[PDB]
Design a protein around this nucleic acid. Sequence first.
RNA 1: GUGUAAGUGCACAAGGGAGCUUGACUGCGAGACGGACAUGUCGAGCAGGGACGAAAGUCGGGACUAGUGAUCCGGCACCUCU
Lengths: 48, 126, 182, 48, 76
Amino acid sequence: VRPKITLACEVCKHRNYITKKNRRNDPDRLEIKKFCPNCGTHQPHKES
Amino acid sequence: AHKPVGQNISEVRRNARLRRHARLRKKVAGTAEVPRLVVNRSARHIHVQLVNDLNGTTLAAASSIEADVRAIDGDKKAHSVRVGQLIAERAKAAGVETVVFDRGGYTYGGRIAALADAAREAGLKF
Amino acid sequence: KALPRLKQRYREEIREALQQEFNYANVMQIPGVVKVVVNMGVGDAARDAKLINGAINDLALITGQKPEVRRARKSIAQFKLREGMPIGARVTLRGDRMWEFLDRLISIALPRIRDFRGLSPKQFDGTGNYTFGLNEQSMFHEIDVDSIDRPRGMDITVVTTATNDAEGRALLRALGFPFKEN
Amino acid sequence: MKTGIHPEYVDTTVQCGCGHSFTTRSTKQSGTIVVEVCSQCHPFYTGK
Amino acid sequence: RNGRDSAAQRLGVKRFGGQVVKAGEILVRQRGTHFHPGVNVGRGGDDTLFALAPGAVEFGAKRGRKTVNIVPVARP
RNA sequence: GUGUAAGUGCACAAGGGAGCUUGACUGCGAGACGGACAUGUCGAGCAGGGACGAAAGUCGGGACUAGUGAUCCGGCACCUCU
């Protein structure tokens, strides 16, 4: 299934971005780099 | 009764070059103040023109055929560099400042890259 | 300062022989070979992958260069074949490598074929390209008999510049191909 | 030429039953290759 | 079994030849690329053609494709 | 052949392959389409900070049209609100 999951920042740790993914294709916690507004730069967003 | 069975390699090369030049002409076009620098490269020479597509003319042109750029004893890359400088300040004389580089369906490297940076360092920014 | 003897032979005497046989109007109508393509279609590799690795080693030892795996471009139920799994390996030989492989094959591999009675000269197709196939891989001394575990034949094709079957067969015969007589 | 993707080449001397010395590159590490039968001694090529 | 149908999508040409338009005005609403964008005409995510500059819509053909262009009407 | 129904298209490829990458962004948005209303749809362009590219440039998910549920009520994270 592709459940709704949340990607939080690393520095301030706000659960900003959400999206779906297959829990069996990528059971490991996702890692992607996205734009964080308040910090104003591009940092990776980690799963919760 | 000597009929070759298939296409010659020259025909295949010409058709492929024309097709992949046309495929890149989708995004590249030249205007009056932003003309298109189209380069044609052969095994012995190289040619460049400044084309304004909306009307279909050539503001400036340069090539290796002319004897002035024939005189340099340098290698083909050197000839391309000289041709790039020549097209650069010919365009300077033509009132053209900014251009778009049409590579003519060839890979951007070797002689083509050589005269590309030759034109770039001569003041024609693109 | 070094040339394969087959290339020297073709450049010196075989070219002149073809010229006098066919009286070409220009010196670049002389038919010369272009490339030699080796195919070994496993087919049974749809079950087990290691057959493909074995074919890879066989082609690497025979030709001298790493072969290319050909994927199955169509899914067929009778052969239980789907898209994506390997089917056969293939090597394209050109220039000095092709000349040396041709020399080695002609002078060593063909006489090593058990009860080798010749190659039928009827295998050309219009443009003078010869396609023949073997049954095993033991004819080459590059690959050891004890090393092998299962026979694996190949499909050798020699595409030439020639336009007709007669010119291609003449060029191959002058090259030293052991054709039959019909 | 991709360096590490192909086997090794070496001056190989092909020896036939007739004793012909054939210096030509191949991949066999023995240096000299001894072969019992070839085109020079095969019945087919010799007309026997 | 029958009786299921979809709502009409109101596709077609919205501005016809000679009509003057403003920037960003939708010209045609289409599923495929039946009309291809021309000069001063863009293409949307759903193949919708919209005007990139003010002017008069002009329907033309280019290399066998029917295209839609915008004629830059003369300023008074 | 285009993930998937059919239709409209796509060979200039939107079809096939490879390299890097996360724009499957943040604040917006002139002007429009369609509509009883609520919905819904397209969008040039500006700023920030990025990806790819030599560059021009393209990128606010997927060739397009289906894959979804208003309001109330409640949960979680942040806020320089009370």
